[PDB]
Design a protein around this nucleic acid. Structure first.
Ligand SMILES: [Mn+2]
Ligand SMILES: [Mn+2]
Lengths: 165, 302, 295, 929, 51
DNA sequence: ATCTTCCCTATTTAAATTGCT
DNA sequence: AGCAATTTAAATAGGGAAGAT
């Protein structure tokens, strides 16, 4: 599948990962990831890396995405579309912490608050140490951290560039 | 010869910016300035510290600050006054056995370029670190001695030629080379979008304390004066292996990258001022760097 | 890769005749037209020469040049009085010391400085005579040789033009060549196209001093294309000044002694090696251009 | 330089060396090259002729002497190039080589019999403590001793009997006792704590009977019964026939063992032990892979079971036999014939033609080079070594920097790295700055050299860089601690490499007076061991004391007695070569060394005394030494200065004394322009090195180059307050010195730091000796023990230097050269000589120099410790941040002339001063505040 | 001095005083009281002081 | 004993051919 | 065109045995 590169440059004044996350947000908000364009990162060792890599099967051109990232052009670099027979596809993994599932136990099982604390008191509290990005969510008005990890390649992708199922 | 540097030798700061107060405006309704309020949301979570395993059962009700634009204004306005002052060669704590030699060694400094890069860091948006990111429109208005200057598209990394920055740079270099002062009221209008989250400067919190303090003057979000002073002097493109302009430091050192560019390779300020008062031939760029440090100021004694 | 042997202490010295020069199994050698393969010590060779019927190859020339052996070709003279043209491959892949060329240029471009260097180099042959004294032939400190070098020094001191230097050059060469002729009791005329042994031994020594002079000039990066002495008769380059500093001190008495004792050319080759090695004439020339360059 | 290279190599290696030797020389035909080359040309030819591979057979001749000989080519004994080479040349009554073969073979088949107990099996498998209650060498010794008590141990079937715990396994049979000591001490020597035994035991067996299990083998002792229940699975074919053939070899040769002397037995058993550890470590290093199970000896890196004990014993036997063969039948690789040595010395080196008065065919030589400093002593030592032929020597010198200085002299005169090997085993970070290309200095560690044939018998092909430089060096310019381990070690196989190094190489020890008393004892032990194999000892010390020169001669004489009776040759005596800058004297001395040595000493004294006095010392009368230092500085600046500028050296004793003198002089109000330096040893890597290079370049007075390293325009007193680090190995030239008295050799050495380079005589006085050491105000009972030979057993009756020294005296080496034992309680010189003859005596004692009987034990390596210092922990400065309790401080900034800063490095603090903060400072390093 | 600690933060607290951003003028209030009897010594002598 | 001649003995040099750059 | 690998083979060196003086 042919692919394109979006490398964050000159982001020292601002962290590199903040520019990476803003690249993800601007690629989300102006379309791009309809259902078939996916992201991958060549340098996840402990950081998310500074290269976004889009491996759309139909083909991503330079002009559409450089018009999309007109806001990041001061510290971005776009390579010409190259080809890759295999891309290392990542997916979204989310975390839950206490009250999250407590409200689930309010609205699914219909139990009271104290017994919902009782079934979950000694449980939960997982801690994801995977490399991540920090995403502005616009439909739900709060900003969060989204965790990415390696999984088998899927035909369909989300609106963010990660695998489905 | 062997003119040894005084131990009390210091220079005053010559680029004095105010705190960058932050307001919410529209793009075509630029006069209605509503102050951006730092909200603060509470977060429930137990404490996890290395020194107190017995206290991890209960406590740490933390309340972390945040600052967004309101949902009716799409433009963030940043107001600050940058005050350039002259006689950068006067030492305030130093004296004049070394500082007078510096005067007579840095008189050939082209202040024009120094001032250009200062006003270009003012205008292009180096003072707007995380909130110029993702803005579809950048604007800078500079008011100086009843003169208004408008800047729209200046790429901040390279110092390209525009006659507007140059116009102000003239009076700024005339101040810096001579005696006096000049004041630039700088208002930045960046169209981020409706309700986009803005970025004030951060107070230092402890390893514990709370997650993040945003900078407040009288409740309103702002950014630090020294942080803007870091932005203005970010003109150093003259060290060896110079890729991007860094803040002019006496050692060429950036904390956030974990490396120092001018330390340990005979291009630090101190070796260059000892070379100046011992009178070896400096080039224009390192002499401009030394004059930029003296504009920045700081105690140079040992 | 080590110090690669400095040029002034390089010792071996050849002019190869009627043999194709090649590389066998690692070393540079020459193969004559009877099957004989003689190896060349390329790490210690100062120069090689190529006479009629010689043919060198590419990687042989590379192993000479990368080691730093200046290579010329002996034939090419076609005039009636002059050693006309000698073709000389400089090892320029070794990047040379620079400021000695800058000093030579700053003395070459200034006309009064070139004349001043012309002066000292004309008395350099006079002191060469005084230092390098052979056991045979003439004695240098006799009345006739001292009288002629005194007249030469007095005339070259009051000289002011390069044509006066060329005239005094001619009287010096006539004076020495004829005094050696008198000592060895022969009639001597310098013709490069002569069958007499005093002449072709002198042309063989011309080739030897040519090779010594390009190795001395290349050791300091000096090109042949900056002749501080020039003229209609004297048009060969800087090699026809740093080569004939050592005619009348080294080669010409050695050529006359070799043509007087009268064995083959190989004893003259080996005698040139012996005197260029024992007195360190190459290092002597290099050190003299050294005290020329920084003054 | 005209050389001729002949090659007699076989195979295609002969052709591969022909390319390189035909790159540098002309071909004269018949595999012979001949031509003119340069000095460094010969070097480049050496470097690319040796590195081309193994089997190079190259002989080079410069004129007619052999330049070099690649390989073990016999080449020239008289004529060069043989013809019908062949075998069976001599075949003598070798006797002692058959004795060493029999002892090593019999012991090596019995050295690891004690790993067969069940405790060692579960130790290798790993279900118990890896430290045994009794070490397996002692268990194998118990096995052999029980078998010898039961059956006739020399001619019988083996069968391992039921053994119990034995406190001692040493009986009376001298040969059995030799085999038992080889078995038990194949890992470590036994250590005897007993004071009466240490007082009295001298003989071979009579000391060996005191070596019990409690001397290190008996660790804790709770599983002894499991440590002595043993299986007998060794009875196989090849092990039994190997044991039988080696036992019968010993049986046939042990008749010459009783005809040996004590000295022989000790040296032969030392050689046998060294070969036994060589074979044991050689077989333990390599992995053999195959095993017959049910019993095991060693473990691999993965901890798996390998090297079963039958084939382990067989492999250790053959490897030790081969070790012995190559160390006893080696023609070692010698250095090049340096052509810049053999010509005549001119002017002040004209005494170096004394080598033309020495015989070139002597098998042994004991040089005592009493020449003064600045005359080229080490060059004269190399000349003396090259007078006998090609050079093979170990230049063992104190300090790293003195080895660097001798290496730089060897490099710039004639010696390349194909013959020289500078060894400093610490990897110091002192680099040369300014210009790497324009240095022409900083002798480094490469050693293109030539790998000797002895590397194949060492463990895992010797080692990497360091031991290859040790063993294979023709000339080994080394720090001395890489050679004093030849005499023996506590634990491990660190003895074998300097032992085999000093076996085939000469020993050259320069300025042995700067070493400690125990250091000099173990150095004379090394001299005895070097003389045990016929090598030549060159001692080079000007201020030699008769006692020292005598005990070094007696060590060499006992060693040459070992070597003479070892080759069954009648001992004619030792060729002693007395040498100084005024003459030489070579005598065959078998007895009356003392009168000849004192006559040479008196002749050197009369050749020193009619020369002009260069160091006139006045002992001050001022009691308080602080103001004595003040008044002496003022007086010697007003008398000794070069146009108002004078250089003074305040030699004090210890570090806090140095900072006390510095802090007094900095606060001293005077019209003199005092500029103070601190020059002690407690300094950080950077700071210290910087002081060294500066001081060496400002106190160089052979030329006027120093006028540009100091401000000589203004009249200034450049004062350097230093500890004994200035009086050892420093080429410094002060205008005058003020000395705190600690020892008389300190007085002579600090006289040697004044007018060292000039020849102008002083008029009035150039040395002002202090009235007392500063320890008088801290300890009036004993004050000269710090950096001196005063001690608790040798106390001066008076500490006044008017009582114990001359008030006006011309200080030279004469007082140290003469030697006086009477009136040692009220004179410093006779106190010095007393200690020197009362510690380095001709006895064996236990910490002495003739040590016999104790070499078998671990006693001379425990109670006589080389470089015996205090605990010494190292506070390390890491990038400006100190490690321990250091606390950087600020100096007085009154008169500091030069102060270099430091960021890295380490300071050596005694554990006593670790209690408090050492308070490191940029100007003066360590103190008490 | 040392350039090898140019890395990592200096990070410390100081005291600051700024004008608020609604007023642009700094006022400094003080009272200077000149006092007479300048030649008398407050606690010195009475000969040297009157001379 | 020493020395020579000759037979193993294989170890040791020189040529020959030929892809490969 | 130089070389490398690699074969092939001619020759060089040596040791043992036996026969001479
Ligand atoms: Mn063992
Ligand atoms: Mn073992």
């Amino acid at each position: 599948y042919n692919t394109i590169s979006i490398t964050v440059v000159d982001a020292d004044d601002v962290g590199v990962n903040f520019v990476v996350s803003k690249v993800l947000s601007t690629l989300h908000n102006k379309g791009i990831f309809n259902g078939e364009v996916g992201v991958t990162f060549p340098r996840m060792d402990k950081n998310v890396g500074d290269i976004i890599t889009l491996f759309s099967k139909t083909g991503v051109d330079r002009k559409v995405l450089t018009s999309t990232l007109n806001t990041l052009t001061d510290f971005i670099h776009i390579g010409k579309p190259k080809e890759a027979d295999k891309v290392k596809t990542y997916r979204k993994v989310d975390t839950k912490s206490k009250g999250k599932l407590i409200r689930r136990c309010i609205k699914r099982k219909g139990v009271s608050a104290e017994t919902a604390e009782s079934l979950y008191g000694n449980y939960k509290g997982e801690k994801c140490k995977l490399p991540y990005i920090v995403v502005n969510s616009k439909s739900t008005g709060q900003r969060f951290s989204m965790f990415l990890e390696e999984c088998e390649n899927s035909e369909k992708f989300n609106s963010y560039g990660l695998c489905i199922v | 010869t062997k003119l040894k540097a005084p131990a009390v030798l210091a220079y005053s700061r010559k680029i004095n910016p105010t705190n960058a107060l932050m307001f919410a405006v529209n793009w075509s309704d630029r006069d209605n300035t509503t102050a951006v309020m730092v909200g603060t949301k509470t977060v429930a979570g137990t404490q996890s510290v290395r020194g107190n395993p017995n206290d991890a059962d209960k406590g740490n009700i933390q309340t972390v600050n945040f600052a967004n634009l309101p949902h009716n204004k799409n433009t963030l306005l940043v107001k600050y006054n940058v005050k350039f002052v002259g006689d950068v060669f006067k030492a305030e704590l130093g004296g004049g056995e070394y500082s007078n030699t510096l005067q007579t060694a840095l008189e050939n400094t082209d202040f024009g370029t120094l001032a250009y890069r200062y006003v270009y860091n003012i205008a292009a948006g180096r003072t707007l670190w995380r909130n110029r990111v993702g803005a579809e429109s950048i604007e800078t208005v500079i008011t100086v001695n009843d003169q208004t200057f408008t800047f729209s598209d200046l790429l901040v990394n390279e110092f390209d030629e525009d006659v507007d920055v140059a116009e102000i740079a003239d009076m700024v270099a005339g101040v810096l080379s001579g005696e006096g002062f000049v004041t630039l009221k700088v208002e930045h209008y960046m169209l981020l979008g409706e309700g986009s989250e803005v970025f004030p400067s951060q107070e230092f919190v402890e390893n514990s304390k709370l997650s993040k303090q945003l900078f407040d003057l009288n409740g309103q979000a702002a950014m630090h004066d020294q942080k803007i002073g870091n932005a203005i002097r970010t003109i150093d493109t003259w060290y060896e292996d110079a890729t991007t302009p860094i803040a002019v430091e006496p050692y060429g050192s950036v904390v956030r990258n974990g490396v120092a560019y001018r330390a340990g390779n005979k291009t630090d300020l101190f070796t260059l001022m000892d070379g100046a008062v011992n009178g070896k031939s400096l080039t224009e760029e390192d002499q401009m760097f030394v004059t930029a440090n003296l504009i920045r100021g700081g105690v140079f004694g040992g | 890769m080590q110090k690669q042997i400095l040029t002034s202490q390089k010792r071996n010295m050849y002019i190869l005749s009627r043999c194709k020069v090649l590389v066998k199994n690692g070393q540079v050698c020459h193969l004559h037209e009877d099957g004989n393969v003689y190896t060349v010590p390329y790490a210690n060779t100062v120069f090689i020469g190529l006479a009629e019927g010689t043919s060198i190859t590419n990687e042989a020339m590379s192993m000479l040049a990368a080691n730093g052996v200046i290579v010329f070709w002996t034939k090419g003279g076609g005039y009636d009085m002059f050693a006309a043209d000698i073709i000389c491959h400089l090892p320029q892949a070794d990047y040379r010391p620079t400021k000695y060329m800058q000093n030579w240029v700053r003395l070459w471009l200034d006309e009064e400085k070139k004349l001043s260097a012309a002066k000292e180099i004309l008395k350099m042959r006079v002191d060469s005579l005084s230092t390098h004294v052979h056991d045979f032939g003439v004695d240098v400190e006799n009345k006739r040789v001292s009288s002629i070098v005194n007249k030469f020094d007095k005339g070259v001191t009051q000289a002011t033009s390069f044509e006066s230097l060329l005239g005094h050059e001619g009287t010096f060469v006539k004076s020495l060549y004829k005094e050696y002729a008198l000592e060895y009791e022969i009639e001597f005329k310098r013709d490069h196209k002569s069958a007499d042994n005093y002449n072709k031994f002198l042309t063989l020594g011309n080739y030897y001093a040519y090779g010594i002079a390009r190795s001395s000039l290349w050791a300091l990066g000096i090109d042949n294309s900056f002749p501080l002495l020039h003229g209609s008769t004297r048009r060969g380059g800087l090699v026809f000044d740093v080569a004939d500093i050592i005619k009348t001190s080294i080669i010409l008495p050695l050529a006359f002694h070799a043509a007087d004792q009268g064995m083959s050319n190989t004893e003259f080759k080996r005698s040139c090696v012996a005197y260029f090695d024992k007195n360190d004439i190459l290092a002597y020339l290099i050190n003299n251009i050294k005290r020329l360059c920084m003054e | 330089m005209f050389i001729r290279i002949k090659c007699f190599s076989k195979q295609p290696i002969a052709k591969k060396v022909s390319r390189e030797v035909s790159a540098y020389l002309e071909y004269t035909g018949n595999n012979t090259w001949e031509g003119h080359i340069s000095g460094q040309g010969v070097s480049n030819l050496q470097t690319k002729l040796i590195n081309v591979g193994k089997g190079v057979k190259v002989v080079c001749n410069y004129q007619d002497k052999v330049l070099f000989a690649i390989g073990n080519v016999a080449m020239s004994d008289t004529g060069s190039v043989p013809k019908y080479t062949t075998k069976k040349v001599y075949k003598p009554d070798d006797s002692i080589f058959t004795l060493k073969q029999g002892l090593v073979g019999v012991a090596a088949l019995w050295h690891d019999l004690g790993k067969a107990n069940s405790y060692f099996q579960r130790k290798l498998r790993g279900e118990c403590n890896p430290s045994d209650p009794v070490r397996h060498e002692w268990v194998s010794g118990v096995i052999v001793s029980t078998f010898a008590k039961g059956n006739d141990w020399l001619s019988d079937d083996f069968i391992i009997p039921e053994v119990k715990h034995s406190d001692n396994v040493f009986g009376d049979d001298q040969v059995l006792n030799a085999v038992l000591w080889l078995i038990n001490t194949h890992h470590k020597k036994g250590l005897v704590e007993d004071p009466i035994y240490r007082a009295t035991k001298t003989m071979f067996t009579e000391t060996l009977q005191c070596v019990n299990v409690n001397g290190g083998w008996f660790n804790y002792g709770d599983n002894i019964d499991e440590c002595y229940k043993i299986d007998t699975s060794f009875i196989t074919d090849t092990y039994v026939k190997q044991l039988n053939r080696y036992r019968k070899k010993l049986l046939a040769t042990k008749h010459i063992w009783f005809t040996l002397g004590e000295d022989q037995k000790i040296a032969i058993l030392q050689e046998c032990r060294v070969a036994l550890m060589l074979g044991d470590s050689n077989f333990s290093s390599d992995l053999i892979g195959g095993d017959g199970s049910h019993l095991y000896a060693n473990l691999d890196e993965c901890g798996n079971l390998k090297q079963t004990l039958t084939q382990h014993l067989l492999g250790v036997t053959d490897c030790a036999l081969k070790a012995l063969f190559t160390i006893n039948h080696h023609k070692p690789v010698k250095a090049n014939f340096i052509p810049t040595i053999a010509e005549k010395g001119e002017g002040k080196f004209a005494w170096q033609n004394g080598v033309n008065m020495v015989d070139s065919s002597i098998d042994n030589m004991f040089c005592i080079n009493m020449a003064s400093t600045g005359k080229g002593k080490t060059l004269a030592n190399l000349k003396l070594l090259q007078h006998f032929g090609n050079v093979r020597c170990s230049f063992g010198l104190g300090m790293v920097s003195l080895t660097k200085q001798t290496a730089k002299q060897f490099l710039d005169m004639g010696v390349d790295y194909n013959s020289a090997a500078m060894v400093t085993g610490f990897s110091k970070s002192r680099f040369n700055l300014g210009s790497e290309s324009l240095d022409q200095d900083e002798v480094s560690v490469e050693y293109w050299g030539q790998t000797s044939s002895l590397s194949k018998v060492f463990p895992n092909n010797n080692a990497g860089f360091k031991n290859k430089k040790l063993l294979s060096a023709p000339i080994l310019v080394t720090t001395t601690d890489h050679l004093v381990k030849a005499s023996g070690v506590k634990k491990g196989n660190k003895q074998m490499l300097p032992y085999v190094r000093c076996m085939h190489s000469d020993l050259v020890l320069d300025e042995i007076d700067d070493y400690g008393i125990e250091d000099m004892v173990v150095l004379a032990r090394l001299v005895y061991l070097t003389a045990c194999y016929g090598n030549k000892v060159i001692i080079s010390s000007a201020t030699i004391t008769p006692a020292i020169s005598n005990i070094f001669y007696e060590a060499y004489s006992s060693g040459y007695k070992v070597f003479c009776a070892n080759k069954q040759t009648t001992y004619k005596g030792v060729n002693v070569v007395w040498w100084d800058e005024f003459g030489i004297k070579v005598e065959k001395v078998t007895d009356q060394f003392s009168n000849l040595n004192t006559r040479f000493v008196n002749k050197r004294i009369t050749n020193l005394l009619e020369s002009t006095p260069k160091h006139k010392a006045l002992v001050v009368d001022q009691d308080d030494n602080m103001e004595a230092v003040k008044q002496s500085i003022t007086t010697l600046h007003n008398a000794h200065n070069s146009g108002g500028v004078s250089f003074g050296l305040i030699r004090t004793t210890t570090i806090k004394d140095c900072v006390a003198v510095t802090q007094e002089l900095q606060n001293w109000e005077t019209d003199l322009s005092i500029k103070i330096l601190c020059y002690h040893s407690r300094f950080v890597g950077d700071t210290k090195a910087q002081m060294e290079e500066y001081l060496s370049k400002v106190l160089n007075r052979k030329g006027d180059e120093y006028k540009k390293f100091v401000d000589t325009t203004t009249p200034t007193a450049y004062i350097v307050v230093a500890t004994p680090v200035v009086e050892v190995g420093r080429d410094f030239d002060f205008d005058w010195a003020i000395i705190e008295p600690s020892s008389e050799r300190s007085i002579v050495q600090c006289a040697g730091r004044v007018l060292r380079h000039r020849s102008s005589t002083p008029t009035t006085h150039n040395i002002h000796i202090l009235k007392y050491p500063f320890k008088f105000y801290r300890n009036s009972n004993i004050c000269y023990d710090v950096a001196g030979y005063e001690s608790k057993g040798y106390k001066l009756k008076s500490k006044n230097m008017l009582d114990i020294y001359k008030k006006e005296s011309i200080v030279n080496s004469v007082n140290r050269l003469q030697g006086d034992a009477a009136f040692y309680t009220k004179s410093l010189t006779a106190l010095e000589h007393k200690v020197l003859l009362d510690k380095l005596t001709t006895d064996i004692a236990d910490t002495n120099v003739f040590v016999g009987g104790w070499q078998l034990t671990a006693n001379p390596h425990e109670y006589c410790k080389w470089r015996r210092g205090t605990k010494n922990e190292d506070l390390v400065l890491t990038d400006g941040k100190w490690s321990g309790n250091v606390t950087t401080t600020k100096p007085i900034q009154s008169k500091i002339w030069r102060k270099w800063q430091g960021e890295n490095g380490s300071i050596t603090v005694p554990e006593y001063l670790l209690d408090k903060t050492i308070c490191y400072n940029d100007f003066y390093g360590g103190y008490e505040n």
